[PDB]
């Protein structure tokens, strides 16, 4: 190839999900968490088992 | 005791339509000089 024309193999890359940036992305306000309770707090959730 | 809303620019400007000032009397000093005030004495810049 050349250093100004290179392309990766097809299906190797995806852009990652940024969460919490406005309404139309689908993960805008509550950022996937749902509304309240212990699982919606930072560092929340409970230990496995 | 305190205003519930701000007052807009139009309502402020409609309020001070009478907040004006008037022109004075302005007679003349007939003998020698510029204009004086009416029923007054032309002392300075005046001979009446």
């Amino acid at each position: 190839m050349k250093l100004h024309e290179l392309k990766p193999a097809e299906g190797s890359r995806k852009e990652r999900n940024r969460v919490g940036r406005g309404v139309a992305t689908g993960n805008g306000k509550t950022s996937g968490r749902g509304h309240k309770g212990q699982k919606a707090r930072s560092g929340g959730g409970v230990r496995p088992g | 005791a305190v205003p519930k809303r701000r007052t807009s620019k139009t309502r402020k400007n409609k309020r001070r339509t009478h907040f004006k000032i008037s022109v004075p009397g302005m007679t003349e000093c007939p003998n020698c000089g510029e204009y004086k005030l009416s029923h007054r004495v032309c002392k300075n810049c005046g001979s009446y």
Binding site: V23, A24, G28, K29 | -
Partner: protein
């Protein structure tokens, strides 16, 4: 002198010499289009077609395949984080009626 034709899904009232604005036909510029459904002819002699005058074409010449002015479609729901926005330009054709029949 006076005709009512049927084009698109709607009806137009024409006189020979004027310009009309119709939903998009499939002709080219400078071509001659002929209209086939005529519902009523007035003027000096009156013909009333039921539904059609059975004859009575209208010829016209074609100018300016075009697109309309852009409108913006916008809606939103009130407390719910949802809205959409999109544009639209509707196509049209311009024609000039030049000759009438009966």
């Amino acid at each position: 002198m006076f005709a009512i034709i049927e084009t698109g899904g709607k009806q137009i009232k024409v006189e020979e010499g004027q310009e009309i604005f119709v939903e998009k036909l499939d002709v080219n510029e400078g071509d001659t289009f002929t209209f086939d459904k005529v519902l009523f002819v007035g003027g000096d002699s009156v013909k009333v077609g039921a539904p059609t005058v059975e004859g009575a074409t209208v010829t016209a010449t074609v100018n300016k395949q075009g697109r309309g002015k852009k409108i913006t479609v916008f809606t939103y729901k009130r407390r719910k984080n949802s809205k959409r926005k999109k544009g639209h330009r509707q196509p049209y054709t311009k024609l000039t009626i030049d000759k009438i029949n009966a």
